[PDB]
Amino acid sequence: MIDLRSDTVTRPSRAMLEAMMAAPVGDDVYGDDPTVNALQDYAAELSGKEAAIFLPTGTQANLVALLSHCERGEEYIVGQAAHNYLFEAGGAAVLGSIQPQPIDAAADGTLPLDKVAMKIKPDDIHFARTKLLSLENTHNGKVLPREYLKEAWEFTRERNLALHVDGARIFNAVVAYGCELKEITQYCDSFTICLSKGLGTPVGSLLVGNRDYIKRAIRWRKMTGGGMRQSGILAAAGIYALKNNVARLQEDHDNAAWMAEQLREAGADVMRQDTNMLFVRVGEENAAALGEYMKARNVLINASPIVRLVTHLDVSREQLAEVAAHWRAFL
Amino acid sequence: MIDLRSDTVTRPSRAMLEAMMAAPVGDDVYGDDPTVNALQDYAAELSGKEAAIFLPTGTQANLVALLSHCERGEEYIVGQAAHNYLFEAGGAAVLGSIQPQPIDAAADGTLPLDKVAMKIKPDDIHFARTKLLSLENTHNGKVLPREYLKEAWEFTRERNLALHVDGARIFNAVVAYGCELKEITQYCDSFTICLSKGLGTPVGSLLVGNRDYIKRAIRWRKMTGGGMRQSGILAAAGIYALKNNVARLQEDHDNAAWMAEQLREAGADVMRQDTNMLFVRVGEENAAALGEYMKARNVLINASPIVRLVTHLDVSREQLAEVAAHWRAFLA
Amino acid sequence: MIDLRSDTVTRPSRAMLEAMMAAPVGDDVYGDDPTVNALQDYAAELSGKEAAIFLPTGTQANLVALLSHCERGEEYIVGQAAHNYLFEAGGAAVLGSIQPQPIDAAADGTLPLDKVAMKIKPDDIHFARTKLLSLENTHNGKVLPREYLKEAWEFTRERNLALHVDGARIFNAVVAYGCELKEITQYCDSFTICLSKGLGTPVGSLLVGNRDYIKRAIRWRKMTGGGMRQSGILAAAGIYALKNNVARLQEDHDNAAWMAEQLREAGADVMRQDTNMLFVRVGEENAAALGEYMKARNVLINASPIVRLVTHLDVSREQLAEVAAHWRAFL
Amino acid sequence: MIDLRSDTVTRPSRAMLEAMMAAPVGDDVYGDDPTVNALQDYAAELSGKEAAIFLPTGTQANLVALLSHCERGEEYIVGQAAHNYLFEAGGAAVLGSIQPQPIDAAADGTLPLDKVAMKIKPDDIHFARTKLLSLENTHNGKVLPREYLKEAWEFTRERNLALHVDGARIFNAVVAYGCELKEITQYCDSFTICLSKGLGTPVGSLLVGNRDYIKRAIRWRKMTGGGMRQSGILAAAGIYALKNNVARLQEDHDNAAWMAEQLREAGADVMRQDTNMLFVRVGEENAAALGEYMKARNVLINASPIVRLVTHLDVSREQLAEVAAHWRAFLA
Numbered sequence A, C: 001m002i003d004l005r006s007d008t009v010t011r012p013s014r015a016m017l018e019a020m021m022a023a024p025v026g027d028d029v030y031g032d033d034p035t036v037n038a039l040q041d042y043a044a045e046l047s048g049k050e051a052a053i054f055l056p057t058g059t060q061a062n063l064v065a066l067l068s069h070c071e072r073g074e075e076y077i078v079g080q081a082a083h084n085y086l087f088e089a090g091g092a093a094v095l096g097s098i099q100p101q102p103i104d105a106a107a108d109g110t111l112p113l114d115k116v117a118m119k120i121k122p123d124d125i126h127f128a129r130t131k132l133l134s135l136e137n138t139h140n141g142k143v144l145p146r147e148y149l150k151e152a153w154e155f156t157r158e159r160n161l162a163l164h165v166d167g168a169r170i171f172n173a174v175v176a177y178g179c180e181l182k183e184i185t186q187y188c189d190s191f192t193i194c195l196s197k198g199l200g201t202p203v204g205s206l207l208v209g210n211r212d213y214i215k216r217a218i219r220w221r222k223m224t225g226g227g228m229r230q231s232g233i234l235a236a237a238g239i240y241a242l243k244n245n246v247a248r249l250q251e252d253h254d255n256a257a258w259m260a261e262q263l264r265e266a267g268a269d270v271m272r273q274d275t276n277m278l279f280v281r282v283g284e285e286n287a288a289a290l291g292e293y294m295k296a297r298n299v300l301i302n303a304s305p306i307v308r309l310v311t312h313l314d315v316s317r318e319q320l321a322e323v324a325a326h327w328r329a330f331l
Numbered sequence B, D: 001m002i003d004l005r006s007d008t009v010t011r012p013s014r015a016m017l018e019a020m021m022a023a024p025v026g027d028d029v030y031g032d033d034p035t036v037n038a039l040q041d042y043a044a045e046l047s048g049k050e051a052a053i054f055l056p057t058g059t060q061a062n063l064v065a066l067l068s069h070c071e072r073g074e075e076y077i078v079g080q081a082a083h084n085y086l087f088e089a090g091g092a093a094v095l096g097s098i099q100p101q102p103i104d105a106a107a108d109g110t111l112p113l114d115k116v117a118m119k120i121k122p123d124d125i126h127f128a129r130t131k132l133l134s135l136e137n138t139h140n141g142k143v144l145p146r147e148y149l150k151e152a153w154e155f156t157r158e159r160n161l162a163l164h165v166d167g168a169r170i171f172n173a174v175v176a177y178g179c180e181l182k183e184i185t186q187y188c189d190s191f192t193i194c195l196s197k198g199l200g201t202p203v204g205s206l207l208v209g210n211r212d213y214i215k216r217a218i219r220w221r222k223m224t225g226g227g228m229r230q231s232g233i234l235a236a237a238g239i240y241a242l243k244n245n246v247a248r249l250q251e252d253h254d255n256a257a258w259m260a261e262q263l264r265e266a267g268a269d270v271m272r273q274d275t276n277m278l279f280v281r282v283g284e285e286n287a288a289a290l291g292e293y294m295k296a297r298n299v300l301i302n303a304s305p306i307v308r309l310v311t312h313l314d315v316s317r318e319q320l321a322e323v324a325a326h327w328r329a330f331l332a
């Protein structure tokens, strides 16, 4: 089965599984789980921050992050297509009583600071209270330019705004930068790390920031239902992935780039390729038919007028070649 | 004192006051106040709708309106510069647990239906549940084209979305249309009426829609703190304004149009005028200075790089001419 | 028409009306209404507090008050039968994201401090954050003992809790105390004043506390929809009532006490009488019939197995005597 | 290390671990994980209900449950000491916009229906809208009498109220009843199952009810952050526990009962024992000292004036005897 629906579909490797079953656990609510502590300590150190916490999903990681930054009546500026506004059911507004202020991102995935400044509300009773700027890196595969990350950092400091980045695929960005995570994370107050995607764990995300911030995050994680007990078995997979699965993300990027070439040669309208993602403009007429066509040959895609293809450790170039041939035959 | 800050600054006429003090009242919570009932019934009748309720402010009118349309987890599509998203402290999200979906309005004040359709969320657990489209008419004075109001009404029917319009200045649009309120209101499920602006009452707004909708709205008005007792004394001004102050809104429109002509001649950068509003592009350097200059001559404006001037029944053309002369002197 | 449903049914006197129509107004949002300012300044001075604001209803006064005291996730301890928990549709929870912690009040209308202390949550992620103690005075007519008001004040200070009192009928308490409002309000951080009841205005309530507190209250009043424009016409009635209608509340108390005597003589089960309220235990069998019986003779009551009778400036003893005679005939 | 803090501290057996690592997984968001589906289908089948969902915690299971039962402005009647009111940071009110109506439970852990009826709000705009009655079984170890569960189910039908039970320790009750889960679960619309306690899994709870209810619950689980991917590896432990660790809960009950007997003999004030829990009245002066005394001998308790001791598969009777000896020495 060839699955290009997302990098979320990754399955645990055997070495990862062996690490999961061998790890010492405890009750994380009591803070007694040594493996969860180790993962959190390692993630904080690796990113140059004071503290971190384990969460079941990236969705809760952002929900807890927004709650920890923004009070009732406060507002976060965010991308119209950003996950913690668009793809989390409006949790920040619905559950958190937080005003979302979405704006269109630039082509490079960046939220233009000139547009952000126009959205910063004056201290007047008619407006919500602008408190947070939320970024996404990578955003649909796109690696935000390093120069912007600095500019956004200084800007938020000058405007007394917090800066959070959704780093569900921040390690995809890191190897695209060719730098250390530390050199990127310095330009944010808090950020997330998804472990259950490209890094290939079955479950888990990380929220990392300063000590007092994370302390509040522990309260909100509890209320939202993320306070697990012996979650060290999951954290074990996270530790393994951070130490073994970061560098090999380059393979996913090369594969996606390779796949874009093959579909371009096959006559498909490849819109763009970024890291481990590639977007093909299939016909609205052809969308449903392509999905069914691929499904019949045991290839799984999310059928859509614009199809997103996502590479990961559970899809090789040999498998990509098979899909590309099916796509070619389809056209 | 010349006040061009807003039409909210309007004060009660002698006749409006005499109507307030003569009006029969009761406890509105028990529904025993004959004057607000009369106002609500009259507003519903005038708009071809089933029911209406009196509210203390237009802000609550919209807050209650969004609460009544959208459940927890549901979403309303709205303008980035629209009032019930931008100028009400985000109440719908903060108090109502409603996801806001703002989009840029077109130059004519309309929310382009092609972008609205792109913002309608699929029935998937990742998205909020799109339920409502909210419009604003007038929007910063701008009168929405009638053809769009029909198109938007039809569009929402096709997508099974509700349609609410912020009609704080809907009567300004009505006389600009030259039609009846009903002929505009037919293109929405619910809409608001502000009474405390151009119509010139001290307090009050109306929310009007169908019977079941308004019944839910009564529950939300109670929770938000708008369930008043003898508000008939306030409603009386509303009845008077609906019957006496609608036609003369043309005066405010002509004044704004005249002032725009006058300010252009005085050397000011007049950007646009729509109904009873006028927008001048003043220097950021000159913004604060102009305000202070005008304040020292008993003229009140909201000092800003872009100044919004709003005409109303408490500012005459003679007064506009006086202000225009001060503006001319300021630019010399 | 004789109306004993509530003191809310009071209608403006002519002198009050003449004051309403003569008062100077402005836009309160801009803070330009001199009459609203005068009322707020007078109420703050009279209560020994720094600031006050005008609101459309007592319900919003409490909703705004709870919002201004309690953040998202914080908790207020309150009576099970208290208005800002029971009779405001759960606004604090539904709109304000505030945990209510209701407890049974004592017979005297007091919330026992030993029970309050047991409800103060430890600083643990499993619990909401206890922040506020809310009192009600009067509570169903009952005047809370002065000694308790002090004890509750010291207790909340020692426990670092805020103390709010619903003073919708606090002036009924004041004349029952025979003291000044100032001597009662010293034992709270914030409190409310309803003007549209016994004081007899058509519309209005007041929220009064410290300067920073009220500043936050202005923001929440805006969001909740209480930011009126030329509300000076309503505030004018408030000023008149504070200066003319406080002392005469004694008449309402004497009338209610007199009425309790008459119904007791007529064979009705009068449960208790407090200030301008009295509660009669009519049959559940007789409840609907009594309501209809009184309605036919142009007497309005809230028909119920326990009927609450409320006196006010629009009901005299001559009218009370008529009702008592109807009640006597009914039995 | 002797841990009597809670049954949450249970660790995976070798066989449970081997089941986890052998289990087929997929993306649960896409619904492609065969093991959680198997667990959910099995839990629904076992309880005579239509559907079930896997959740990371019991807290989210209840939060999602209340969200799915009660809309914004609606109310759930619940115990003052109940978990989904007291021990979940008030999530239902804070996140869910749900009015909580707590009442004191009776000594037997039941919410007396006469007080419940007194808390059911009339359909009036002054009140929240009573919609749900939430129970807890077991409640601090206490097994709710079967007759009450039937009475409460019937009562809620008559009042058109929903009935949810917090069944974090429902299987402890089941073996205490000596009946089948179905025979208990029939008296509710929805209920929860914690897997990470007495059943001994590292992570997981279940929410089970009817198809439409659970479908709504899936939306709320997503928003609250419980929509995991390959959680089948976690669900595998749940399947193992349901099939192997239910009957042996009797062991925990006998242990707690034995410990209560043993501690009474040692001179401790044993207040009560119910299923796998035991409550001792220690001095407030001795509370902190006892904890430190036990901690220094590798015995973990939650030091408190009233100490809750909880037995589980990771504490033997031999270990209980050791602790009882330390307690005896402490009191001498």
Ligand SMILES: Cc1ncc(COP(=O)(O)O)c(CNCC(=O)O)c1O
Pocket: A005, A006, A007, A008, A056, A057, A058, A059, A060, A083, A084, A087, A136, A138, A166, A168, A169, A194, A196, A205, D227
């Ligand atoms: C940028 C980003 N942020 C947050 C999340 C949320 O992660 P969870 O699914 O673990 O909650 C996702 C997953 N989005 C779906 C996908 O890309 O396939 C994401 O892509």
Ligand SMILES: Cc1ncc(COP(=O)(O)O)c(CNCC(=O)O)c1O
Pocket: B006, B007, B008, B057, B058, B059, B060, B083, B084, B087, B136, B138, B166, B168, B169, B194, B196, C227
């Ligand atoms: C279009 C619109 N809608 C709603 C409101 C809110 O009404 P209240 O302020 O009475 O709540 C206003 C007033 N907005 C401020 C102004 O234009 O001066 C408005 O202009």
Ligand SMILES: Cc1ncc(COP(=O)(O)O)c(CNCC(=O)O)c1O
Pocket: B227, C005, C006, C007, C008, C056, C057, C058, C059, C060, C083, C084, C087, C136, C138, C166, C168, C169, C194, C196, C205
């Ligand atoms: C103690 C108390 N507090 C607050 C309120 C709310 O006031 P509004 O009705 O102005 O919102 C009331 C009115 N309660 C209804 C009655 O006693 O008749 C009340 O009695």
Ligand SMILES: Cc1ncc(COP(=O)(O)O)c(CNCC(=O)O)c1O
Pocket: A227, D006, D007, D008, D057, D058, D059, D060, D083, D084, D087, D136, D138, D166, D168, D169, D194, D196
């Ligand atoms: C009855 C009950 N319900 C729900 C929960 C919440 O489960 P999670 O902690 O897995 O979210 C607990 C655990 N309460 C803490 C204890 O008894 O140790 C509980 O005892």
